[PDB]
Every structure is written in C-alpha cells, then in structure tokens.
Symmetry: D2
C-alpha cells in the first residue's frame, strides 16, 4: 500500500521521527508519503482523506486522537534579548491561524498584560529566526530550546502556559486503523 | 516594508544574523519574510516578488554576498546501520533541490551505486526520515544533532563541496531598500 | 592589568560563562582570565578562601553578594522514548551529595508522597546526562539540558513542579579586590538598564 | 557485581548513552559507576585497574580498542568571531595534557601557521565556554557543533584535521570476564 501521513511543521521534526521509524519497521514494504502543512490545515487534510493519519499539536473535535507526547510550553526570546518591563510584550507570531497565535494572545489578555505583534510571518522558519534575532518574544514547546534562546517566565512578567500535546489522529468514519492501534498497544508498554 | 526571501535550509541558520541587523539599524521598517523551497529563490528575486534573497544556491545573474561557508556532511541516524556494498539509500527532496543535484552527482562522479529510499517535498519531512533511520542525506554541518551520525570516507562516502550562505540582490531594479541594505551588509562582511 | 579568577559549577560554566567571559574580555581586553570549574558545592568555600575572585553558581549563598544573570525553569528529564511506569517508585539518576538538584529532587518528591529509588548515582554531570539519555532513570535540571535525546516529564506524568534555577554572579564583600568588585559592578550594568 | 567504566569528559555524554544503554539491556543484572576524568588520565585508570573499560578519543597503546564512532574533527569559533588574516591564530585549548591540544599544534606546524595560546583552561567546559565567548579558536569533533559556534574550514585558511575515534577500551592481560563480555557485546552489536 501507500501510507500518507500529515504532520504540522511543529510536530513534523519533534515526534514524527519516532512514529515514522516504527511505521517503516513493522510494515517495511509500505511506501511513505509525509505531507507537512501548517497546523491549521491538518483538520481539512484528515477530513478529505488526503492523509491517512495526522500528527498535530491542536486537539481536533471529530477524530479519535492518541497522545504521543505532552510538552511544557515556554515563552522564548533571544539569549541576549532585553525584555523591557513597562512596554507591551513584543510578540513574534505566525499569521492566522496557528492555535499558538490564538493561545498566546488569550494568555497575555487573561493576565492583563499588554502585547503587540512586532513580527508576523507565514512559516515557523520566519518566526524562529525573528525570535533568535531578538525582534521580540514568542511561545513554543520546550523542544525549540537552542543556545540561541532564553526562557522568559514569571519573574520577567509572563504568565504560565498550557501544555503541548503531540497527537496522532485517526478517522473512525484499514491501514489507518492498524497503525493507530499498533501505536496504542505499544504506547502504554507491553 | 522590506520583503526577504529565504530558503527552508538557510532560514534559521543565516537569517537571524541579517534580520537582527536590518531591524536594529533601520528599526522602523516592516518585514515580510517569505520562506520557500531552495530552487524557487532564483525565480522570486527576478519576478520582483521579493526585495532580497538568502539561499545556499549561488545564482548566476545576481549580486551574491557570502555570509557563511560551512562543510556539507552526509548524515544518517545515530543508530543507523549503513550496509556497505549494497546501494546507498538516499533520503532526498523531490526535484528540484540543488542538494539533490549535488548528492547524486557526487555519488555518480565517484561511481557509487545508490537508490532513492525516500523522496520528500519539505525539509521537515526529510529530517524526520533521516532521524528515523530510513537512509542518508547530505546537509550543511548546522543540521548535526544527537539524533544523527556523520558519514565520512570510512563508511564509503566521498567528500562533499562546501555550503555557501548567500545574500543575493538584483541590480536591475530601482529598489533602494534592496541596494542600500545589500551595501549595508557589505559594510559588515568587508567594509 | 591583573588576572581574574572565576569559579563556575559544571552546569553554569556551559550555560552563562560564555556570556560572562564575553562581557569581561571586551571592557578589560588586557585582563587574564583563570576559570576553575568544579562541582556546585565547592563554590561557596572557593570564594571565601579567595582561590577565585568571583563565582558563578546556582546555589544562593548566605555570606556573599549575588547578581542574578539568568533564572531558568527546572524540568524533569528522561530518555525521549523512556517509559515511566506509574505505580513503581521513580528510578532517579543523581549526583551523590553534595548537589543542590539532588537535595531538591529528593525534598520535592518527599514533600508530595511520591516514592523513588536510586537507579543510578554518578560522580560528575557528564555521567548524569549520559545516564538520563541512556534511559536509566529520571533527573531534574534547568531547561538548558533539553536535547532531542530527551523528553520532559511534567504534571501529567505524576511529578510535582520544580522551583526555578538561578545562575548567580557572586562577590565577596569582606574583600579588597578592586578586580572582583569592579568586574562585579560591570555585570549588573549590562544585565539591567 | 560493579562494572566500572571510565569515559573522557568529551565522549562521556556523546557516545556513552549508547554503550551504558546497551550494558543495562543485556545485563540489567550489574551495578555501574561511570567516572569521567580528563582525556589523558583514561589510560592510567585502565592499567591500574581502577576501571574495567574506557571510552576515549586518544588511542591507548596496551589495550584492546573497539572503534565505535569515527566522526570528522573541525575547527570551531564563535558564530560571529572575526578571524584576522596574517596575524597568528589565537588558540583556545586545554593545558597539557589533552591529545587534542597536541593534535592542533602538530597540524598547525605541518602547514607553518603562526599561532598563540589566547586562552588556556583547566576543564573542557571552560575551553568550550571561551570558544563560545569568542576569545579564539579550538578544534573538536563535529558533535560539539551548536548554534553558538561556527565551523572554520579550508576557506578561511586552516588546514584539514584527522577524524575522531570514540574507542571502547579493555585490558586483555587482566581477567575481568565482565569487561570482555561487555567489549564483545559492543563488538557483536557495533557490527550486525
């Protein structure tokens, strides 16, 4: 057969290595089409059966969703960046939609923290680069950590964040089913 | 409103350096950084879609300032087993990528048997397959993570050309942002 | 123009000593730098005996001035594909005493009635990280240890939160070393406007 | 019983995750204390039988030595470090002994390149920290590469460097049956 996997850029390089390793070890005859789009497009890709399985950081509402990894989410800035207390937090964000864009704005609002969109771009590479160059502050899971970056946390004025879930998602409505369930009886243990 | 195009490769490696300097010396100026695949960089700078370009493929018709020279290495999974004797299983982009063109030529010019074990459309798809131990690729030395192991001559792979990180400009436009920023980044690498 | 002796613990030598040594050897380009790197516990003794003029540690002293250079979150780590069986005592990878992180991880887990066992005790950090990555157990370290070999354990895995780790530049006020104080006075004027 | 492995500070965290991982899956039956000392002191530890195995990047003369990893060795400096042309190359090195210091000076003499010791340190973390702080140049295996750093190659005028071998080391003239059984386990599992 031909297994098509959809993964967000975010979960593509963090948790797809471990999955894609296991896919090509138990079913070694099977061709692998890994399609990477933004995290927003992942629902439409699984609904329209463009992909057989999905690895996302945004829980869907209509599809069974197995959790592969839960990461703490951190505020990030450049290692030598200066977070100016008093002015709005200068945010470096994706354009609409990334739940993370939606999520970080909600979190700073619920803490009465002014913010600003210092840099909006359409891809993670543009966002990652802008934080590292120190154009402002962003939020991603703990796996984005490089020596380029520093964590901004409560003492710098930034509120706690929800966890990141890296979710394998499957549509109940044959090769999608067996691979999901092979990851599910191999996830807990045994 | 300076629009900078950067290859998927060179986006996080060499654009932090540039994007830092533009938004510090000319801190007023809005930034549209559009990042596409490595091949589309040539087309984008001529068609005036971008003001500037940062790629690892030297163009022939554009000014090209070299921002960094890194060695290119073969990579496989840290725990990968490369079976010497049977064909080199490549993890590559689909056409086009100069890295693909360079890898096949370097394997062809040294008469090494190979195969496409995995052809992908994006770097995140390629990296995942290398790290999962689906085959080998060649990328600049900046991709080295603990997931990966370096293949060198010892394992049967010939040396690879350097990776050049290029800031590129089209002189045939009226773009002051392009020209003065290209000359400004020339005032740092070699004033 | 003198020879500045800086003491750093294994952890804060790697994380923030590049940042420190960069700032020192740009304002005083003539000044020689002797950095002696030991465990985190020997750091208090070293500054009082003026074996070093200044110290960078993650354990706040009781007797010394302390400039805060970075406050990082502290996280539990295990190997990326490690399996934490809920129900068995947590197998810990630790240093022997003394190490602040040990005292914290033991105090942390005791403070919330979670059983543990010493799956691996090591003598040095390179041994500890190697043991965490080998999937021999759990640890707690600042977020700066995070590599792809590893996975972070949080609340959903049954582990309590951790107090932050502070990377502190310290000075002996019971001293006469213009070197220590004036270099100390340089580091807060770049970490704060 | 108790398996004592010595690792260099260098190779302790690079390739010892794999070995100590493999020891504890085939023999979860034995306790193991890994003590990491400087890269030179590894040999004396195995001859004086303080440790049963060694993992080093400096080949010893008296002991069995399994090749576990051959990775390219590179010049490093700070990502934005500025290497002047003719002026002598300012080196960031350990003080004697680290064979790496011996190797950097040996190869820089084979091509007649002027140098100077801009920064000598006591520990690997102090040397790497000075390289990252951008006080000069060092040469370390490709596993040191982080975004802090840039690689110096031929383009900038520094000569080529030899590979690094991460070697599992054992003394055959000592009858540690546990040492050899772990050596052959890493030898029958480094070759499938």
């Amino acid at each position: 057969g031909v297994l098509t996997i959809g993964a967000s850029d975010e979960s593509a390089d963090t948790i797809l290595p471990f999955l894609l390793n296991r896919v090509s070890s138990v079913y070694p005859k099977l061709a692998l089409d890994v399609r990477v789009k933004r995290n927003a497009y992942m629902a439409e890709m699984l609904e329209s059966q463009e992909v057989d399985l999905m690895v996302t950081t945004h829980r869907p509402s209509a599809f069974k969703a197995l959790n592969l990894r839960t990461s703490p989410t951190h505020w990030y800035c450049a290692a030598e960046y200066i977070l100016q207390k008093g002015e709005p937090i200068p945010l470096v964000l994706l354009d609409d939609p990334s739940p993370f864009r939606d999520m970080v704005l909600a979190t700073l609002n619920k803490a009465d923290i002014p913010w600003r969109l210092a840099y909006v771009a359409s891809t993670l590479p543009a966002v990652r680069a802008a934080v590292k160059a120190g154009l402002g502050v962003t939020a991603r899971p703990v796996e984005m950590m490089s020596p380029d970056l520093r964590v901004l946390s409560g003492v710098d004025g930034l509120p706690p964040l929800p966890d990141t879930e890296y979710l394998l998602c499957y549509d109940p409505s044959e090769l999608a089913q067996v691979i999901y369930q092979a990851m599910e009886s191999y996830h807990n243990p045994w």
